[PDB]
Amino acid sequence: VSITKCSSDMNGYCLHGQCIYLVDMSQNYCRCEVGYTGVRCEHFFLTV
């Protein structure tokens, strides 16, 4: 399985989303809420 649940230490890392664990990269990334962009979903993707 590509996606794993992040450990609770990565709780607030995703500002507008949920943390996901990539096992192949062995790293923590984000699942952004709709409309938010960035690694941590920090900035709102501004509609034209």
């Binding site: 590509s2 607030g12 890392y13 500002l15 989303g17 996901i20 990539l22 192949d24 990269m25 790293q27 990334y29 984000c30 699942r31 952004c32 809420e33 709709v34 938010y36 962009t37 960035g38 690694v39 941590r40 979903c41 920090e42 900035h43 709102f44 993707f45 501004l46 509609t47 034209v48």
Partner: protein, 500 residues
Amino acid sequence: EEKKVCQGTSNKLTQLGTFEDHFLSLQRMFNNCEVVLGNLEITYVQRNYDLSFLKTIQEVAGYVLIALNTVERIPLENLQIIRGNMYYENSYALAVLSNYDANKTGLKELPMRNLQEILHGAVRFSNNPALCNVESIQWRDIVSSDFLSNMSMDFQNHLGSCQKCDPSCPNGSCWGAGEENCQKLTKIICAQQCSGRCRGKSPSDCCHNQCAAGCTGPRESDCLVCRKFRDEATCKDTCPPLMLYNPTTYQMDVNPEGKYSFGVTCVKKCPRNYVVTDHGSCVRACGADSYEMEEDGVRKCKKCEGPCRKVCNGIGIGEFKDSLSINATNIKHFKNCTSISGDLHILPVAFRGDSFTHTPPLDPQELDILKTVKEITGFLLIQAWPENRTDLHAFENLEIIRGRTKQHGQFSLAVVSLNITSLGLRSLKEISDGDVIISGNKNLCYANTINWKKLFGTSGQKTKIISNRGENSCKATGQVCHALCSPEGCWGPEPRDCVS
């Protein structure tokens, strides 16, 4: 036509909601994009999803990332150069990683036949169980000799489903399977007389030093891609100087071909936004001992006599390069700044605090410091504000937003998801460049009353004001401009906020 350009994406390997939403955002960003200024990321894409728009992409200035794709084919057919201005994982300009699926097959087709030079960086291939014939591609011609050691390319595909390369193909190195999908050698096949690239092995068939990937002749215009700078159809090492050296000159050798420097190109005249230096270049900020003045309404570097104003860098640049928003750690450095030589971000994480960045919470009263600023060279982004305050009090004295740098390359002013009742940007007189977006502010009213066109300076600027408190709701609550100012709108309910 000219050159169609897209800013690119730097989201690394982060999902944007559902898979379909992610693919949607991708196609918006890279539709019709001939040249990518930023990073081209193809991630979380699904099988049987159309990706043909990628055929239009000719250039990528940053890095190319291709990962988490269950797709059979990504058509970067016309991509020819990766400048390597930005590296992924600090050492890879091209990365193809973990392109697998629940089924064994993942990515199988990557026909970058036109790809010939990666100016900076290395290439990494990993966890690719369906890739075809990319193994045969020899990367001595494509990748720079200095970055060859950092390359870590390993292919893991024993399916044998991939076919073989055509007999007309040099050393059997082919991208896909057809004769069009083969290695084009413009570096290894060159003679010892050529400097850089070459059209053929003969000494008569060399490329000019600034010809980048390849050439059709030993001329600057015959360069397919420009290496450093570009003038008309020619490629040059430097923008032509307004004053050049001469063996004997009665007067300074003013060059009729001399042009100003803007980004990768050389323009005839710098924009009104940028500092026109005496050397001849479009610069964003004056250096040391130099401050900004207007000789004829255009900004220039005049030498400070002794003490000189502090150059307060914006958030996201300089010392605060990796800082997401202004916070308690960096707010002290903006104590007595009258100008923001950069761009200013405000995000909700600052008030809550972040343990990952070891950042303490931000005090709402401290924000009052920002009252000293009157000019923002870049852009203003406000996604958070103290709940007690009903207006943007700190930016009440802000006058001009130069918009030299814009959020997502488009918006110079952004105010999203705030509870403020009024903007209160009374002193704002000019938005020199960039669009304005005011969205999702549930209790904000006094936005459409203002004519933003008078604020806009550069042609083509547009405004987008939506999802704020309705005009009927604000009118029913008596939240309409004061009677002392009939036209031009206002920034708030009180008479002080009226425009002139």
